[PDB]
Structure 1
Amino acid sequence: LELLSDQGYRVDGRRAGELRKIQARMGVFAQADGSAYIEQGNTKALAVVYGPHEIRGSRARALPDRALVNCQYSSATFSTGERKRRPHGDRKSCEMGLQLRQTFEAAILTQLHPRSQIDIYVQVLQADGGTYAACVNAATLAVLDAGIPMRDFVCACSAGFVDGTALADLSHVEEAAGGPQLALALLPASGQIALLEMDARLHEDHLERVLEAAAQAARDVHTLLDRVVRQHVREASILLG
C-alpha cells in the first residue's frame, strides 16, 4: 500500500510537513472547576480538572513541600471501528496516566500548594491518530481554564519516517505500518522537552531529522492554540469590567 506517492501527497492529501485542522474550546462544563475540548483532525478528546482541595481519604499520604498531581486516562467503548470494551484494570490506561502524571509534574509550577491534590481526568471520545498529544493539549487547555499557574504552555506533537523523509502528525493508517514513531512534549519559550518516546527500529543517522521535524510541528501547534487562548481571554476581559 502506498503511504507516500511520487508526487509527494499522502493518503489523505496533505504534504510531509502539514498538520490536520484543530478546533478547540474552553469552559465546556459548569459543575467542575475547569474544562476543555479539542478535536485534532479526526480525534476527539476531552479534559476535566479539579482545583486544589482536601486530600480524599486523609490516609496521611500528603507531601509537606508540594502538591499531589493525580492524572487518569479513559476511553469510550465506541472510540474505534470495533467495540473493544476494556475493564478498568488495563495497563494501557495505567501507562497513559503515568506519562500524563510525569509531564504534568514537570510543567505545573507545583511548589505553591503544600498538602493539596490536583485531580485531572481525560476522556477520549474518538481515537484516530496520536492520542497522547490530543490528551496533553486538552489537559493543557483545561488547566489554563482552571487558573492553575504553570511555567509555560506545554504542547505535544508526533512525527515519523518513511522513505528517507520525516513526516508530521501521523494518522492511524500510518501508525499501524511498523515505522519509527516518535512524540515529544515541548515548552516553546525554552525549547525544553518534557517527555520522549519511541518504538520500532531506526538508524542513528536519521534521529536528528525526525526529532527536529517533531519539535517544529509542536511549535506549529503552539501558534494555533495560542490564538485560541488570546481570543478567549480577550472575550472574558470584554465581558468583565
Structure 2
Amino acid sequence: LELLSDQGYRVDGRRAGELRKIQARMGVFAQADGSAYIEQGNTKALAVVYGPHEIRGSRARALPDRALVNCQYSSATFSTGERKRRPHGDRKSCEMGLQLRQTFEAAILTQLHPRSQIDIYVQVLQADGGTYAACVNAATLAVLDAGIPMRDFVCACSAGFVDGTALADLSHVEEAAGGPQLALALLPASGQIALLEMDARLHEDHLERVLEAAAQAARDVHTLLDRVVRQHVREASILLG
C-alpha cells in the first residue's frame, strides 16, 4: 500500500491534480418535484427536493420574510463495509444537515418563497471517500431539476496533503490515513466559498496550496455538472417543441 508513488501516481491510477469520473443523472423519481443521482467514483449519493410547499403544524416557525430550508442527511447502513445502525438521529448526520442547510440557504435565494418549506433529502448508498461533496452536488442537481431559483451551481469537493503535495478528491484510503483533508463548497461565478470544513493537523504555510487545489477541483466538477445539465435542458426543450 502507498499513496504517492515517487513517480507522481496514486493507487487508483490518477495524478494528484485530477479526480474520478462523475457519472450523474437528473430525473430519477417522478413522484417528487426534483430528483437527482450521482456517482463520483464508487460513491453514490441520491438527492430529493420536495418543493416550496405549505407548512403544516405551523408551530410558529413559518418565516414571513424568507423560506424555510429543511435538509436531512442519511448514510445507509450498508454504505461502509463495516455495518452500522442508527443512520439518522446520530450526532454526525445532524451536523451534515446543518452544513447543507447553511450552504443552500446561502445559495437557494429564498427571498422569493416566503412562508414555505424547501425540503431537501440526501441518502448515501455507497461511500468510498468524498461523502459530503457528492451529496452537495446531488442536491444541487436536484434543486435545479425542481426549477427552484438559485444563485449558482454550489460546487463542492475535497483536497488533501501528502508528501508536500496537494491531492484532489480524496478516496477512503487516503482519507483513513489520517492526513489533512479539507472539504469545501464554493460558488464559481463569484469565487466565493459557501462552506469550508477541514480535519487534521498541518502547518499554515501549507494551506494556500490545498485551498487553491480544492478550488480548482471544484471548478472541474462545475464543468462536468454543467455539461450534464445542458444535455438535460436541451433534450427536454427539444421534446417540448
* TM exceeding 0.5: yes
1:215 aligned residue: 215
Residue by residue over 1:72-95, the C-alpha shift from the partner in whole angstroms, topping out at 9 and shown as x without a partner, is 001211111121122532011100
Per-residue deviation, 1:153:
0.8
Report the Cα distance in structure 2 between the residues aligned to 1:124 and 1:3, rounded to whole angstroms: 25
Deviations for 1:17-41, whole angstroms, at most 9, x for unmatched residues?
A: 1110111101111111110000001
Query: Greater strand share, 1 or 2?
Result: 2
Quote the Cα distance in structure 2 between the aligned partners of 1:16 and 1:236: 37
Q: 1:87 to 1:44 in 2, by over 3 A?
A: closer
Q: Is the 8 A contact 2:73 2:88 kept in 1?
A: no
Q: Tell me if structure 1 keeps the 8 A contact 2:62–2:115.
A: yes
* Cα distance in structure 1, aligned partners of 2:156 and 2:63: 29
Name segments (4+ residues, structure 1) moved above 6 Å: none
Q: Which runs of 5+ in 2 are unaligned?
A: none
Give the Cα–Cα distance (whole angstroms) in 2 for the partners of residues 237 and 34 of structure 1. Answer: 17
- 1: distance between equivalents of 2:200 and 2:6? 25
**Deviation string for 1:195-229 (max 9, x for gaps)?**
11111111111101110100000001000001000
Give the total of aligned pairs. 241
Give the C-alpha shift of residue 56 in structure 1.
Answer: 2.2
Q: Percent identity at matched positions?
A: 100
Task: Give per-residue Cα distances to partners, 1:36-88, cap 9 Å, x unaligned.
Answer: 00000110010010111110212121111000000000121111112112253
CA deviation digits over 1:107-139, x for unaligned, max 9?
111100111111110011101101110000000
Deviation at 1:173, TM superposition (A): 0.3
CA contact (8 A) 2:77 2:87 kept: no
Offset from partner CA, 1:172-193 (integer Å, 9 cap, x none): 0000111111011111110000
Runs of 5+ consecutive residues of structure 1 not aligned to the other structure: none
